[PDB]
Amino acid sequence: NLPKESVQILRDWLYEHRYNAYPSEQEKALLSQQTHLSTLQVCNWFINARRRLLPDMLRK
Amino acid sequence: AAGNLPKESVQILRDWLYEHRYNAYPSEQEKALLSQQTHLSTLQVCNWFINARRRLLPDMLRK
Amino acid sequence: GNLPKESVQILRDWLYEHRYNAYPSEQEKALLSQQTHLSTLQVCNWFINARRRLLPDMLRK
DNA sequence: ATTGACAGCTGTCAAT
DNA sequence: ATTGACAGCTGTCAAT
Ligand SMILES: [Cl-]
């Protein structure tokens, strides 16, 4: 599993950008740096999160 | 009267067979790669394939 | 910068030789990385494309 | 159903 | 007219 603390960061960036859920190449580094997860894990989390967490957020 | 084959080698072959069940024809080098993995001669591998194709592959292509 | 034609010949040949199930395993993918002096990535890609572009024309037999 | 990961595809681009 | 790459998607997996 992923750290509980990193996911809330990713969750937060995602909500803050729910209608443009696409971090630039560099933001992926910034969030990777901010979450201490590899850019592979962050690219992945976004691939996963856009499917699984985002709809419930856009459902507002 | 040679004894039955190593269980790990037959599983290795059985899996390769499954992994290529829609074309159970290992090339010279695939036959080679399986020899070294099984510590078995290419006669054993040529044959084990000759056998399994008649005796084990049908049960596989049936799903 | 394009891939060595001999590397492409090794890949192109494998593709034709395995038309039904044209999906090399990790061990096969590694062996083509080694046989072509290519990273395991470059081949993954090459096949992803070749499956689109070369298999339709190759199955016409 | 949940979660993190990865393989193979689509669409696409820049280059050949 | 074709080539190699890549971002992001889909399907799914193993574990939950
Ligand atoms: Cl939130």
Coordinates of C-alpha atoms (C1' of nucleotides) and ligand atoms in Angstrom, one line a residue:
Chain A
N1 CA 0.0 0.0 0.0
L2 CA 0.5 3.7 -0.5
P3 CA 1.2 6.0 2.5
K4 CA -2.0 7.5 3.9
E5 CA -0.3 10.9 3.9
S6 CA 0.7 11.0 0.2
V7 CA -2.8 10.0 -1.0
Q8 CA -4.3 13.0 0.7
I9 CA -1.9 15.2 -1.2
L10 CA -2.8 13.5 -4.5
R11 CA -6.5 13.7 -3.5
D12 CA -6.1 17.4 -2.8
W13 CA -4.3 18.3 -6.1
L14 CA -6.9 16.2 -7.9
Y15 CA -9.9 18.0 -6.3
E16 CA -8.2 21.4 -6.8
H17 CA -7.9 20.4 -10.5
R18 CA -11.0 18.2 -11.0
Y19 CA -12.0 19.5 -14.4
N20 CA -8.3 19.4 -15.8
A21 CA -7.0 16.4 -13.9
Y22 CA -3.7 16.3 -16.0
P23 CA -0.5 17.4 -14.1
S24 CA 2.1 18.7 -16.4
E25 CA 5.3 16.7 -16.9
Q26 CA 6.8 18.9 -14.2
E27 CA 3.8 18.8 -11.8
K28 CA 4.2 15.1 -11.8
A29 CA 7.7 15.7 -10.6
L30 CA 6.5 18.3 -8.1
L31 CA 3.9 16.0 -6.7
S32 CA 6.4 13.1 -6.8
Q33 CA 8.7 15.4 -4.9
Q34 CA 5.8 16.5 -2.7
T35 CA 4.6 12.9 -2.0
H36 CA 7.9 11.0 -2.0
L37 CA 6.4 8.5 -4.5
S38 CA 8.1 7.8 -7.9
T39 CA 6.8 9.5 -11.0
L40 CA 5.7 5.9 -12.0
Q41 CA 3.5 5.7 -8.9
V42 CA 2.1 9.2 -9.4
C43 CA 1.5 8.6 -13.2
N44 CA -0.2 5.5 -12.0
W45 CA -2.3 7.0 -9.2
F46 CA -3.6 9.5 -11.6
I47 CA -4.4 6.8 -14.2
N48 CA -6.2 5.0 -11.4
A49 CA -7.6 8.0 -9.6
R50 CA -9.2 9.5 -12.8
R51 CA -11.3 6.3 -13.0
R52 CA -12.0 5.6 -9.3
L53 CA -11.9 8.8 -7.2
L54 CA -12.6 11.6 -9.7
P55 CA -16.2 10.7 -10.6
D56 CA -17.3 11.0 -7.0
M57 CA -15.6 14.4 -6.9
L58 CA -17.2 15.6 -10.2
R59 CA -20.5 14.3 -8.7
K60 CA -21.2 17.6 -7.0
Chain B
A1 CA 12.6 -48.3 -19.2
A2 CA 13.7 -44.8 -18.2
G3 CA 11.9 -43.4 -15.2
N4 CA 9.4 -40.6 -15.2
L5 CA 10.6 -37.1 -15.8
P6 CA 11.4 -34.4 -13.2
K7 CA 8.2 -32.8 -11.9
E8 CA 9.6 -29.3 -12.2
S9 CA 10.7 -29.8 -15.8
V10 CA 7.4 -31.2 -16.9
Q11 CA 5.7 -28.2 -15.3
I12 CA 8.1 -26.0 -17.2
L13 CA 7.2 -27.7 -20.4
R14 CA 3.5 -28.0 -19.5
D15 CA 3.5 -24.3 -18.9
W16 CA 5.4 -23.5 -22.2
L17 CA 2.9 -25.7 -23.9
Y18 CA 0.0 -23.7 -22.3
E19 CA 1.8 -20.4 -23.0
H20 CA 2.0 -21.4 -26.7
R21 CA -1.1 -23.7 -26.9
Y22 CA -2.2 -22.2 -30.2
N23 CA 1.2 -23.1 -31.8
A24 CA 2.9 -25.9 -29.9
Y25 CA 6.0 -25.9 -32.2
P26 CA 9.1 -24.7 -30.4
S27 CA 11.9 -23.6 -32.7
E28 CA 15.4 -24.9 -32.6
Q29 CA 16.3 -22.1 -30.0
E30 CA 13.1 -22.5 -28.0
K31 CA 13.8 -26.2 -27.9
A32 CA 17.3 -25.1 -26.9
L33 CA 16.1 -22.7 -24.2
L34 CA 13.8 -25.4 -22.8
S35 CA 16.7 -28.0 -22.7
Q36 CA 18.8 -25.8 -20.5
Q37 CA 15.8 -24.9 -18.3
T38 CA 14.9 -28.6 -18.0
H39 CA 18.4 -30.1 -18.1
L40 CA 17.0 -32.4 -20.7
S41 CA 18.3 -33.4 -24.1
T42 CA 16.7 -32.0 -27.3
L43 CA 15.7 -35.6 -28.1
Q44 CA 13.7 -35.6 -24.8
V45 CA 12.3 -32.2 -25.7
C46 CA 11.5 -33.1 -29.4
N47 CA 9.8 -36.2 -28.0
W48 CA 8.1 -34.7 -25.0
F49 CA 6.5 -32.3 -27.4
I50 CA 5.7 -35.0 -30.0
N51 CA 4.0 -36.8 -27.1
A52 CA 2.2 -33.9 -25.3
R53 CA 0.8 -32.5 -28.6
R54 CA -1.2 -35.8 -29.0
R55 CA -1.9 -36.5 -25.3
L56 CA -2.0 -33.2 -23.4
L57 CA -2.6 -30.3 -25.9
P58 CA -6.2 -31.4 -26.9
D59 CA -7.3 -31.2 -23.3
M60 CA -5.9 -27.6 -23.3
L61 CA -7.3 -26.3 -26.6
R62 CA -10.7 -27.5 -25.3
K63 CA -10.3 -24.7 -22.5
Chain C
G1 CA 17.9 7.9 -35.0
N2 CA 16.4 4.7 -36.2
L3 CA 16.9 1.1 -35.0
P4 CA 19.6 -1.1 -36.5
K5 CA 18.1 -2.9 -39.5
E6 CA 19.6 -6.1 -38.2
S7 CA 17.8 -5.5 -34.9
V8 CA 14.6 -4.8 -36.9
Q9 CA 15.3 -8.0 -38.9
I10 CA 15.5 -10.0 -35.6
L11 CA 12.2 -8.4 -34.4
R12 CA 10.4 -8.5 -37.7
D13 CA 11.3 -12.2 -38.1
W14 CA 10.1 -13.2 -34.6
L15 CA 6.8 -11.4 -35.4
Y16 CA 6.2 -13.4 -38.5
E17 CA 7.4 -16.7 -36.9
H18 CA 4.7 -16.3 -34.1
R19 CA 1.7 -14.9 -35.9
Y20 CA -1.0 -16.7 -33.8
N21 CA -0.2 -15.4 -30.4
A22 CA 2.2 -12.5 -31.5
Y23 CA 2.8 -11.6 -27.9
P24 CA 6.3 -12.4 -26.6
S25 CA 6.7 -13.4 -23.0
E26 CA 8.9 -11.4 -20.6
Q27 CA 11.6 -14.0 -21.1
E28 CA 11.1 -13.7 -24.9
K29 CA 10.9 -9.9 -24.6
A30 CA 14.2 -10.0 -22.7
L31 CA 15.8 -12.3 -25.3
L32 CA 14.9 -9.9 -28.2
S33 CA 16.3 -7.0 -26.1
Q34 CA 19.6 -9.0 -25.9
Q35 CA 19.5 -10.3 -29.6
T36 CA 18.9 -6.7 -30.9
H37 CA 21.1 -4.7 -28.4
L38 CA 17.9 -2.8 -27.5
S39 CA 16.3 -1.9 -24.2
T40 CA 13.3 -4.0 -23.1
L41 CA 11.2 -0.8 -23.7
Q42 CA 12.1 -0.2 -27.3
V43 CA 10.9 -3.7 -28.2
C44 CA 7.6 -3.5 -26.2
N45 CA 6.9 -0.4 -28.3
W46 CA 8.0 -1.9 -31.6
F47 CA 5.6 -4.8 -31.2
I48 CA 2.7 -2.6 -30.0
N49 CA 3.1 -0.7 -33.3
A50 CA 4.0 -3.7 -35.5
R51 CA 0.9 -5.6 -34.2
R52 CA -1.1 -2.7 -35.6
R53 CA 0.9 -2.2 -38.9
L54 CA 2.7 -5.4 -39.9
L55 CA 0.4 -8.2 -38.7
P56 CA -2.6 -7.3 -40.9
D57 CA -0.4 -7.4 -43.9
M58 CA 1.4 -10.5 -42.7
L59 CA -1.8 -12.6 -42.0
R60 CA -2.7 -12.2 -45.7
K61 CA -1.5 -15.8 -46.3
Chain D
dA1 C1' -15.5 -4.1 -4.0
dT2 C1' -10.8 -2.0 -3.2
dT3 C1' -6.1 -0.7 -4.5
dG4 C1' -1.7 -0.4 -6.6
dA5 C1' 0.4 -1.9 -10.6
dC6 C1' 1.3 -3.1 -15.3
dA7 C1' 0.5 -4.9 -20.2
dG8 C1' -1.4 -3.8 -24.4
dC9 C1' -4.3 -0.1 -27.2
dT10 C1' -5.7 4.2 -29.0
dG11 C1' -4.6 8.4 -30.7
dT12 C1' -1.2 11.1 -31.9
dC13 C1' 3.2 13.4 -33.1
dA14 C1' 7.6 14.4 -35.3
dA15 C1' 10.6 12.4 -38.3
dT16 C1' 11.9 9.7 -42.0
Chain E
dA1 C1' 3.9 6.5 -47.3
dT2 C1' 6.6 4.9 -42.9
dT3 C1' 9.1 5.1 -38.1
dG4 C1' 9.7 5.2 -33.2
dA5 C1' 7.9 7.1 -29.3
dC6 C1' 4.8 8.5 -25.6
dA7 C1' 0.7 10.1 -22.8
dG8 C1' -3.2 8.4 -21.2
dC9 C1' -6.9 4.6 -21.6
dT10 C1' -8.7 0.1 -21.0
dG11 C1' -8.6 -4.4 -19.0
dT12 C1' -7.4 -6.8 -15.6
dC13 C1' -4.7 -8.7 -11.7
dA14 C1' -3.6 -10.1 -6.9
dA15 C1' -4.8 -8.9 -2.7
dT16 C1' -8.2 -7.1 -0.1
Ligands
CL1 CL -10.2 15.7 -0.7

